[PDB]
Design a protein around this nucleic acid. Structure first.
Lengths: 93, 532, 493
DNA sequence: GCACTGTGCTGCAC
DNA sequence: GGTGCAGCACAGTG
């Protein structure tokens, strides 16, 4: 599925994004777990990405594969295409 | 009924294409001035309707055809609301011709068009403008009929030529320096007109005088001076709605009065909406407001948990809009009351505040109020007195304080009001005494040099046959170049979308620049001062 | 960055006469009203108040007879009321009961504690200034040792770039600066600026002088003035009088009243990505046809000339129309720091154009990408008053000139005069209604009531102050002044 | 006509 | 020091 990092992203804006993404037909989740195979950050540094990955390790079964640790660029590409876009190097940190 | 219908008479005679080297053709100059006029018409989104007639046309088209009468004349565009179609028609579709026709026939057909097409439409004013050479052969045998019919129809007229009227100054006679379009300097002298031109000038002059006394002479302009005035819009003005009030002294004395916004800083009336760079739509882009704590966590804030407040030095006092409504100061409706009177010298020009200047007459159709206000004006004049007045537009208005002084003209007399500032508005400072500066004392030679510079760089010449000073640079008649530049850019973009912004035309610089003689005189003194 | 110093000697409690007040009264009211005006303007330049000659002392170094009243802080409502309690003779009686008065002191240690107060500042310091209020002109004339030490320490402050301004108060027998403070006050850098004020006997003059000394010269902008293409000087623009507005509301938290950092966001809806002016375009639709311009194109077409002023020429003052006003007038002063030798030529031009009674017409571009405005520089000569107050600075008053688009045609009808007897009656009425006018004689009642409400809310007082609106005419007073003249004019309608 | 919904703009401000 | 953001009195226009 797809999960969104609410901090530094705004709760109302995140809710709007989740609504438009679920109306797009693809599975979006509100809670941090391991089912979501795609999680988009908000121009966060790589070390902050690692710290949030550790926090996800806390709030998810240990040893599970990480989701798609991409940035807003891939999200906007996928929304513009109306479907998931192939992942590129500029997306992940 | 607030609309208005106008007719534009264009010459495409063989003389229109004829031009003097270094000078634009009359055809092209009139084309440019009408382009400016229609730009102001369309881009202000006015409801005025326009018709366009051509005389001297190689072809001919009009309902008044027959024989050779009203031939070589084409009604290029009928009377209706403007659009960019006629704009591009003037841009490229309008071409000069080689034939000639009687402009009286053009006036006749335009008046007939007004008689016929305006049926079913109710305007406020009717106006026609004419551009011609005066050197075209014509016939003059129905003038009285034309004058009587147009007076019966009550339609104003206006004339523009590639030359100004008879003058003996340096602005109507070709002096030193080349003639420039739109400048404040010389124009065509009494050396380029023809005998036919003199004949046509006499005809139009007698028409103008028989219509409107001496003022009819004023309604004749050259293209260059028309480019720097609003005379083309002089016949389509919309009078501002009068603002009434009751001037009062004490609780006893009251005079009903009417005021107008005499001087107001204008402004464009179309915001620049931001749209998509691709779909060119504003709706598909959403504007939102961010609410976060003044902290490092940047926690989002719900709008409900937000309450307004105000800073009071050290502290911040919370507040609510109901509190605002309940303890805000409230005036007493509208008000125009005289606090008293003070010497004219006591009030200085620098203290004027506000973005507006009001001019006040007595209440319309009130002889008693009129004579009372006139006597008050005369008393103020004789006593060198100005009245402090507390102004209030209405109940919701902020109570302003200001000054009002008499202003007597030949045609009327009024009270001119300008808002004065409260003591909080003042910000005083100190500076160095330049007249006694110990290090900036200029030499006497520097004083003589700057005196020569001032003498050479005068913008107003004192005529001495009547001993009256004539201003050589009237800025109050120059329009705002901002609107003209905006119109030019919008037109260029509309006609051509894949080109950069067009450059500013020469006449725009000429209208904004002083007469060349001023620069020529200032040449030597400027360099002399530069050595200091 | 502003400290007030006040003596507590017995003379400060001695009013010269009955209708006059003690110097303590004027000083207290001056400080209170300065605090109020600063609150109106901005919290900039924190203020402190301290007294010397008190029987007690509260300074940190515990120098005897120096009682600190308020540290350099933002103007707080509690501080304002604490100061206001001193207003009136009740305030002085209360003050003398716990701090005392009329004690000896050494001004060297007073200025020492002033320096300590200045060093307490750990923020953006603009202008360190001491503001002394005393009517005594020879405090250490009894012993030259204290005078010499004070002179040395004042030289120390002036070396360390500390401003000192003294308002000698009204004293029987007059006041002489040269007695003690000729070598104490921060002497200006020019004898033209070395003008000495007069001892204040009222309140309003003291406020004018104090706020004049307080107001730092804040130039609106620095613009180049082009006499021609080559000769260019630099001038500071100043905004003498401007619209004072109520402070904007501040978004806060409902419970803790913590201010809400408010921002804005612009973004697409079909894709949701945040957008910039580059990502967007400017649109305006006429009829059916939409016209699209780049933002860069809009501010490029807005621009006409580079920022600055291009002189057009000179025109006699008579041609200027007083009834042609569009925008509040500005002030133009030279600036030597930017352009070499600008001040001398500026002053020469000013003097000569004053002699010839001609203003300078010139185009004016405020800053980047603004259409030009034709304006007139009228030479405003320096003018003073009996109190040496610069009631009129020297320079070039800038007045805006309207274009033909800014004027308005008006309904013109029959113009009728009135009989001379009615004119004489109106003359008598005006004579009965005449009075002297000062630009500061009035104040905005709306803002006064607004700040009264704020003060009541901050002080937790359910007793809002009611403004005595001076703009309301004294109806019955002028009715009594006029009497039957208004009736006589009334029968003439 | 009341409430309002844009501009430009100028005090903010290192 | 400097764009822009917001607030808002007035204007016109029904």
């Amino acid at each position: 599925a797809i999960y969104l990092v609410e901090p530094r992203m705004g709760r109302s804006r995140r809710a709007f994004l989740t609504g438009l993404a679920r109306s797009k037909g693809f599975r979006v989740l509100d809670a941090c777990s391991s089912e979501a195979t795609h999680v988009v950050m908000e121009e966060t540094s790589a070390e902050e990405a690692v710290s949030w990955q550790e926090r996800r390790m806390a709030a998810a079964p240990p040893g599970c594969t990480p989701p798609a640790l991409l940035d807003i660029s891939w999200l906007t590409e996928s929304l513009g295409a109306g479907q998931p876009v192939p992942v590129e190097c500029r997306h992940r940190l | 009924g607030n609309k208005a219908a106008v007719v534009l008479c264009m010459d495409v005679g063989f003389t229109m294409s004829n031009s003097i080297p270094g000078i634009e053709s009359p055809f092209e100059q009139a084309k440019k001035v009408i382009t400016m006029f229609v730009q102001r018409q369309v881009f202000a989104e006015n409801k005025d309707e326009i018709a366009l007639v051509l005389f001297g046309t190689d072809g001919t088209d009009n309902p008044l055809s027959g024989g050779d009468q009203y031939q070589n004349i084409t009604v290029h565009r009928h009377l209706m609301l403007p659009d960019f179609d006629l704009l591009e028609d003037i841009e490229s579709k309008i071409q000069p011709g080689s034939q000639q026709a009687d402009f009286l026939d053009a006036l006749i057909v335009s008046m007939d068009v007004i008689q016929h097409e305006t049926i079913g439409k109710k305007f406020e004013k009717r106006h026609i403008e004419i551009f011609t050479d005066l050197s075209s052969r014509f016939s003059k045998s129905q003038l009285d009929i034309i004058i009587h019919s147009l007076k019966k129809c009550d339609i104003s007229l206006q004339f523009f030529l590639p030359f100004s009227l008879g003058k003996e100054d340096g602005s109507g006679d070709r002096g030193d320096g080349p003639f420039r379009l739109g400048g404040h300097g010389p124009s065509f002298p009494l050396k380029g007109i023809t005998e036919q031109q003199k004949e046509g000038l006499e005809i139009v002059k007698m028409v103008m005088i028989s219509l409107e006394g001496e003022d009819g002479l004023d309604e004749i302009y050259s293209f260059s001076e028309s480019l720097r005035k609003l005379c083309v819009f002089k016949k389509i003005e919309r009078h501002s709605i009068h603002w009434p009030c009751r001037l009062t002294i004490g609780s006893n004395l009251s005079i009903r009065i009417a005021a107008y916004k005499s001087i107001l800083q204008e402004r464009v009336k179309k915001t620049w909406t931001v749209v998509d760079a691709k779909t060119l739509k504003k709706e598909d882009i959403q504007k939102e407001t961010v609410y976060c704590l003044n902290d490092d966590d940047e926690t989002e804030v719900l709008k409900e948990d937000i309450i307004q407040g105000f800073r009071y030095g050290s502290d911040i006092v919370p507040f609510s809009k109901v509190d605002e409504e309940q303890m805000k100061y409230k005036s007493e409706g509208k008000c125009f009351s005289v606090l008293g009177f003070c010497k004219s010298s006591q009030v200085q020009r620098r203290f004027f505040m506000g973005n507006q200047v009001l001019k006040v007459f007595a209440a319309r159709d009130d002889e008693a109020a009129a004579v009372a206000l006139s006597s008050l004006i005369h008393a103020l004049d004789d006593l060198d007195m100005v009245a402090i007045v507390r102004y209030a537009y209405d109940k919701r208005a902020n109570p302003q304080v200001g000054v009002a002084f008499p202003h007597i003209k030949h045609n009327y007399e009024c009270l001119v009001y300008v808002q004065l500032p409260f003591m909080e508005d003042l910000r005083q400072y100190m500076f160095s005494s330049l007249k006694n500066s110990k290090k900036y004392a200029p030499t006497e030679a520097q004083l003589n040099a700057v005196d020569a510079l001032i003498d050479s760089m005068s913008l107003a010449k004192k005529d001495e046959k009547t001993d009256t000073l004539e201003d050589l640079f009237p800025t109050t008649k120059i329009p705002n170049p901002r609107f003209q530049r905006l119109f030019q850019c919008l037109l260029h973009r509309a006609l051509h979308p894949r080109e950069p912004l067009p450059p500013i035309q020469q006449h725009i610089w000429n209208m904004l620049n002083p007469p060349a003689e001023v620069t020529t005189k200032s040449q030597i003194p400027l360099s002399k001062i530069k050595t200091l | 960055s502003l400290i007030f110093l006040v003596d507590a000697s017995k003379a400060m409690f001695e009013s010269q006469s009955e209708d006059e007040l003690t110097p303590f009264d004027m000083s207290i009211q001056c400080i209170q009203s300065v605090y109020i005006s600063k609150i109106i303007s901005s919290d900039r330049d924190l203020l402190a108040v301290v007294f010397y000659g008190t029987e007690k002392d509260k300074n940190s170094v515990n120098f005897k007879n120096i009682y600190v009243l308020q540290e350099l802080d933002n103007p707080g409502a509690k501080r304002i009321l604490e100061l206001d309690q001193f207003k009136g003779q009740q305030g002085q009686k209360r003050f003398q009961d716990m701090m005392g008065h009329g004690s000896d002191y050494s001004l060297s240690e007073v200025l020492w504690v002033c320096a300590n107060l200045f060093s307490d500042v750990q923020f953006k310091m603009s202008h360190k200034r001491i503001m002394l209020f005393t009517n005594e002109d020879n405090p250490h004339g009894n012993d030259s040792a204290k005078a010499s030490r004070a002179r040395t320490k004042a030289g120390d402050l002036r070396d360390t770039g500390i401003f000192l301004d003294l308002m000698h108060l009204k004293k029987p027998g007059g006041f002489d600066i040269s007695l003690f403070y000729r070598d104490i006050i921060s002497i200006a850098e020019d004898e033209d600026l070395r003008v000495h004020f007069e001892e204040s006997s009222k309140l309003e003059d003291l406020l004018r002088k104090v706020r004049a000394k307080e107001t730092r010269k804040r130039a609106l902008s620095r613009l180049k003035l082009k006499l021609n293409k080559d000769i260019v000087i630099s001038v500071g623009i100043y905004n003498l009088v401007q619209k004072a507005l109520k402070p904007p509301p501040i978004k806060l938290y409902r419970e803790t009243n913590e201010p809400v950092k408010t921002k804005t966001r612009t973004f697409n809806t079909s894709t949701g990505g945040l957008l910039l002016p580059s990502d967007t375009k400017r649109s305006q639709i006429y009829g059916s046809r939409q016209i699209i311009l780049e933002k860069e194109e809009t501010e490029e077409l807005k621009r006409f000339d580079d920022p600055g002023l291009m002189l057009m020429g000179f025109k006699p003052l008579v041609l200027l129309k007083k009834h042609h006003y569009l925008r509040p007038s500005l002030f133009v002063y030279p600036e030597e720091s930017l352009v070499i030798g600008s001040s001398t030529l500026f002053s020469a031009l000013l003097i000569k154009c004053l002699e010839k009674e001609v203003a300078a017409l010139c185009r004016y571009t405020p800053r980047r990408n603004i259409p030009p405005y034709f304006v007139a520089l009228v030479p405003q000569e320096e003018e003073l008053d009996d109190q040496k107050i610069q009631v009129t600075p020297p320079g070039f008053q800038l007045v805006f000139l309207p274009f033909a688009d800014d004027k308005r045609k008006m309904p013109f009808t029959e113009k009728i005069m009135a009989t001379p007897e009615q004119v004489g009656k109106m003359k008598a009425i005006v004579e009965k209604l005449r009075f002297t006018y000062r630009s500061d004689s009035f104040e905005n009642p709306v803002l006064q009531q607004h700040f009264r409400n704020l003060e009541a809310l901050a002080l937790d007082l359910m007793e809002p102050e009611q403004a005595v609106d001076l703009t309301l005419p004294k109806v019955e007073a002028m009715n009594k002044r006029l009497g039957s003249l208004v009736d006589e004019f009334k029968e003439l309608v």
